């Protein structure tokens, strides 16, 4: 035995940064997208989702990297000075911005990153922030149980396999700069890298296209292709 399995380890399997979200933030004269709130999850994309759903439970420290790409929108010769983007983390319960100049942007206790355009992509790390002892990719249950004494069925009605409505909060991204006379549109791509990963209860990989945050399937349910029984 001289061939090794260093690259098949769980840490190596997730050691790549996967894009999990693309957020559009526009700066223009203040129906608008001057600030964008994105709920944190890996299920907006399939690749990392499929890799993680190889297992039932996980525990990993995350690393987020933000790549910002700005462009003009129908500019004739209108130009702009280098922009600064504010990415504020809003955990469940904290107030959420209602405008791009709201008081919530003060970031007194909410962590925030101020990224200057043209610099290196903004990278930070997060520890395991799970309420339980491990993350639950699959939850075979509800959060509310409808009881006999409930006045109406909606009291106990809950989404299947949904644990909490506000899983880990949102990221609110704005352009701190005031509006230039010409519109500037930017895309922030968030790349998520698990680290120190531990996994439990392996599961078969998804074989059909994802349909929503659950195991629901709707279309393209015939994956295997035609092949002769005795054809090599």
């Amino acid at each position: 035995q001289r061939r090794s399995r260093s690259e098949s380890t769980i840490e190596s399997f997730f050691a790549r940064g996967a894009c999990v979200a693309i957020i559009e933030v526009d700066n223009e004269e203040p129906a608008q997208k001057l600030f964008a709130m994105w709920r944190i999850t890996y299920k907006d994309t399939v690749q990392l989702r499929r890799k993680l759903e190889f297992f039932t439970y996980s525990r990993f420290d995350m690393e987020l990297t933000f790549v910002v790409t700005a462009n003009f929108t129908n500019t004739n010769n209108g130009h702009a000075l280098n922009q600064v983007y504010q990415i504020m983390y809003i955990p469940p319960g904290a107030p959420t911005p209602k405008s791009w100049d709201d008081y919530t942007w003060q970031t007194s206790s909410n962590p925030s990153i101020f990224y200057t355009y043209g610099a290196a992509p903004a990278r930070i790390s997060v520890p395991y922030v799970g309420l339980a002892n491990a993350y639950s990719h699959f939850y075979d249950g509800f959060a509310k149980v409808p009881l006999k004494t409930d006045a109406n069925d909606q009291i106990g009605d809950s989404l299947y396999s949904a644990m909490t409505v506000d899983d880990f909060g949102v990221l609110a991204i704005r352009v701190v700069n005031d509006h230039n006379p010409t519109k500037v549109t930017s895309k922030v791509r968030i790349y998520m890298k698990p680290k120190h990963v531990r996994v439990w209860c392996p599961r078969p990989p998804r074989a059909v296209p994802y349909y929503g945050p659950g195991v629901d399937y709707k279309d393209n349910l015939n994956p295997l292709s035609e092949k002769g029984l005795t054809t090599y």
């Binding site: 002892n133 004494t149 392996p202 078969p204 659950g214 195991v215």
Partner: protein, 245 residues
């Protein structure tokens, strides 16, 4: 193969899921009232049967004092011992795959996502049945809000063939007539609510179709017997009465 005695119930290969025996972590532990084999309602395996599925501990919600402890206390944990019995003659042929899936989330029948109701998602001891194809619900006025498992997709968007990654046992009528799986408590928490969360899912699929001699129609019984093991509850309060309709 050998005697299997738990509490006051005895059953005349057995696989331990993930190589872990059920174990304990002031939790209330009924050493006898709950540690015993409860027999679920028998199902009938025919030539046109697609499969069956049950959810644990939901299947034992009305089984003796185990259900009473489950409903009275707030959060409880329990391992299980599942024993599937299917006796056939030497001239019968077939094979059953018995899979114990942790967090056996199933797919719905409507375009709305995660819209399955608690009543339908918790069938109890009767369980449910897989289907050959995906039948989309069309009753917009009164959606059924029930699962639509697919046999070859395992009801979760994965291929049936890879389901053997889960703890499994094959009842092949030519060699064995019973299967036994010992499941420990598997969850992201040391203890969790049982009324709202199901820890395990038992799926029985007819891998090879049943056949007998040259008979057109043949059906044989399958009986599931589940023994809670090392079950402990905590958070005693008034009794929970779920709305099953």
């Amino acid at each position: 193969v050998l005697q299997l005695t738990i509490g006051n119930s005895t059953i005349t290969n057995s696989v331990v899921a993930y190589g872990r025996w059920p174990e304990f972590i002031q939790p209330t532990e009924p050493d006898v009232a709950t540690c015993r084999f409860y027999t679920l309602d028998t199902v009938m395996w025919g030539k046109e049967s697609k499969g069956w599925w049950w959810k644990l501990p939901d299947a034992l919600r009305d089984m003796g004092l185990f259900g009473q402890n489950m409903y009275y206390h707030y959060l409880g944990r329990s391992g299980y011992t599942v024993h599937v019995q299917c006796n056939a003659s030497k001239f019968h042929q077939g094979a059953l795959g018995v899979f114990a899936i942790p967090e056996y989330c199933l797919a719905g029948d409507s375009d709305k996502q995660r819209y399955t109701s608690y009543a339908n998602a918790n069938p109890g001891e009767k369980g449910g049945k897989f289907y050959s194809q995906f039948n989309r619900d069309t009753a917009v006025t009164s959606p059924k809000r029930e699962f639509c498992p697919v046999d070859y997709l395992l009801g979760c968007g994965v291929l049936l063939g890879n389901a053997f990654v889960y703890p499994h046992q094959i009842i092949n009528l030519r060699t064995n007539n019973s299967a036994t799986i010992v499941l420990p408590y598997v969850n992201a928490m040391a203890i969790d609510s049982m009324v709202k969360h199901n820890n395990w899912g038992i799926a029985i699929l007819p891998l090879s179709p049943l056949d007998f001699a040259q008979e057109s129609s043949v059906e044989i019984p399958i009986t599931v017997t589940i023994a809670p093991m090392c079950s402990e509850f905590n958070g005693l309060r008034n009794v929970t009465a779920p709305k099953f309709q």
